[PDB]
């Protein structure tokens, strides 16, 4: 059963929060030896949180909106009393976090129950969650295939039925990619919407945080719970809460909805194209729209990512390079060696890009693209082919995501199930202007209502 | 950048910044770097003038209310 | 005459704007062969502007606050119909500016009369205005000595009595240094106060623009005329006008005023220390205050400057390095070659630094330091000695200025005349918190009233 | 960074970015670069944590009024 039904069951007294918690724990125990989505299980905390919700209910209180809902978080999120790994072995010896990440604190205040920390690509640099230290996370729809990444545990935990909600991060695709590949819902909010405080960073200029979920209502409820200014967070720009839940079912009448072409068609395989086509038909989008400078947008994101992420770890690259993830350490080193001219040019281009993207959205409410070029490849894949062009697998998974996060536009990743595709899912990006998350969510809800976007559980 | 120029650069830059690279690792670093150099080359095609500023410019303190 | 007497004389009808204009033009004609402050004299424009002020007066109109005041600008400022040189020969083939710089437009609207463009170090990289293409600007108090830089024409034109007001730029010292060395007044406003639109840039992250003048009233009047938001300027953060002129004579009773030590004493020669001592005594300041991380603040400014300034010129450095200024072209090239890690570290340190400087000013209203380590050296000097320690002359002139502009704090540079110094002036920095220009100006006015800060012939 | 490592870096980095340097010019560039390297080294002494962010972080668009 989905988020809404879980919450209703606890609110109405049909099930205790403690029973809901114990069910999730037992599912994790039975499935995670194979899926490998969890790196840490906060059992004692979960049970005390669930117990506290049952005490409040028994006192006759009005419960908060996520009361009793289990969730887990990508292990770059600080969990009080636990050392924040961020998929690394380097971080193992750091002191345990003194406080929960702000987003964890907000979910806790909304009554949600934390089950633990989830696997990720080391230091968030990767799209496949093939972690050498902790092992790969496996796709629950086919365990010989990747879950996607870098938030692979976040996507897999939901698709395996372990939790209904998780938190991930997305810099150049890392929420949208696992949502696509695992067949679950994801939301990458506007850059600067959700507080990044108490999380281990990757690219200060581009990191976003957000939920993945078993339903579009799950996204909206978690997003509303997490919203709010945080003056202690340098990246936050949102000065007030703009609730999405009350308008989730408003529909899309009168919205201008387009389908992205060019880069977003050329880098989409046949299943990705079919997913966009069916989503477009359902949403009444028929016009093909060009995104400005998409390939250069990717290029600039790539440049900034490599230098800012590499330089962040320079001290450790100097003294213990052998302790990094061997699949990405050479990419971090490359990033450190990049001419400063490339970085500055990318930052100057980003002003022009922001102007062009904001201008594009003066004519459009929602734009549609595929989330990934193909569905989940086999674990251990080095090279993929997309419409006859070979790419390294690991970077290629973000070809379609990377231009969009660079502008910081909000995106709902809606899970679809195209026909010629070995039963594997592929996601669609519903992209709106900065600050218009509730449009993305409204469009998602229409896809969900018609049966086009769904999980397979 | 030719492959020979990339090899010399990777070697000298890695030494300069304090991350000495063994031969197989220098080759792997150059492979990634070469891909990124193509991306950077595309950025150089965008016309920028001197007054095309950085996307974010310093703010020394919040401007006081009144 | 001085600024206030010119303005009052024109307003009262005792002297015409056109006569004031012709006096400035004739002084330029008689003195500038040697001083070499001007690169372009806008004679026809000056006469037309002065004539227009006299027409408005004859019509009975209320004249604006700078009516009839002659001024000139550093040749990085766009002047309509003139090619913006920015001290280079490279820019000579660029199209003439289609409009005046915004600050020039604002001075014009206030009634001021433009006499032309002033010599500077090429592309603003230097503290001595020893320009190989256009020749050095010479100090009017001793023409075998430097005027300082990079706004050397701006300082020399005022000390030679050519104009009462000029505009300069200041990234790491370039208003404060010529003010110090020429014995004139300077104001470097808060970073983001004054619009940079229509000027040739150097370092996007650090450039400031501001006036130099024959009096502290000159600074305040010109500053007030230039203030105001400019939505088309990406660097501007000032949302309203905060007039300084009405409070200029309020005095300093009750203000907390301190004297900077450590870095600001160690890098100050005997004359610089004597100037601070007398200014401190006059302003009632006795407590020695440590500026946070001053040497590192300089370092980070230096790093960011060289990369951003060098990369700005990369296309020209690729094809025609021999056409740049020989004294700086290798410094621009060095800047382009700086590892990206140095740049990123400096930008991250700048957040820490900003926090520490703003915290420092919770306890202080004004802090006093010398503007330059010594008075003007001989033209051609490569090495100087400060308290027995050697430094390269050109970078060294900004040792005391560079930490302060990196935080973006406003500064008035007050001209003083210490003993046992060959009759040469040296400036004092009056530094306030961001947005507190009117405190700097109030402190300057007390120095001016007591006769400690003044110009000379 | 030794002087010999600086010289190799200046040569390779200048070729990589497209700035042709004759030997006398490369030596003058290395002289300035060496002074800057000491400044950068001092900057490396400042303790920063991974969550010590850049002074300015991207703003995708103004937050809307209401
Ligand atoms: Mg090689
Ligand atoms: Mg080794
Ligand atoms: Mg009369």
Coordinates of C-alpha atoms in Angstrom, one line a residue, chain B residues 8-57:
Chain B
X8 CA 53.0 16.5 -20.9
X9 CA 50.3 18.6 -19.2
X10 CA 48.9 15.8 -17.0
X11 CA 52.4 14.9 -15.9
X12 CA 53.5 18.5 -15.0
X13 CA 50.2 19.6 -13.5
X14 CA 49.8 16.5 -11.3
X15 CA 53.4 17.0 -10.0
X16 CA 52.8 20.7 -9.4
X17 CA 49.6 20.3 -7.4
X18 CA 51.1 17.4 -5.3
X19 CA 49.3 14.3 -6.8
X20 CA 52.2 12.2 -8.4
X21 CA 50.8 9.8 -10.9
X22 CA 52.2 6.3 -11.8
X23 CA 52.2 5.5 -15.6
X24 CA 48.9 3.5 -15.7
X25 CA 47.2 6.1 -13.6
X26 CA 48.5 9.0 -15.7
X27 CA 47.1 7.3 -18.8
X28 CA 43.7 6.9 -17.1
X29 CA 43.7 10.5 -15.9
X30 CA 44.6 11.6 -19.5
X31 CA 41.7 9.6 -20.9
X32 CA 39.2 11.4 -18.8
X33 CA 40.9 14.8 -19.3
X34 CA 40.7 14.4 -23.0
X35 CA 37.0 13.9 -22.9
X36 CA 36.6 17.0 -20.8
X37 CA 38.8 19.0 -23.2
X38 CA 36.3 18.5 -26.0
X39 CA 33.6 19.9 -23.7
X40 CA 35.6 22.9 -22.8
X41 CA 36.3 23.5 -26.5
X42 CA 32.5 23.7 -27.0
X43 CA 32.3 26.3 -24.3
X44 CA 34.8 28.4 -26.2
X45 CA 32.4 28.6 -29.1
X46 CA 29.9 30.8 -27.0
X47 CA 30.6 34.5 -27.7
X48 CA 31.3 36.3 -24.4
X49 CA 32.4 39.9 -24.1
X50 CA 34.4 41.4 -21.3
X51 CA 31.2 42.7 -19.7
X52 CA 29.7 39.1 -19.7
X53 CA 29.9 38.6 -16.0
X54 CA 30.0 35.6 -13.7
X55 CA 26.6 34.1 -12.9
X56 CA 27.1 35.2 -9.2
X57 CA 28.9 38.3 -8.0

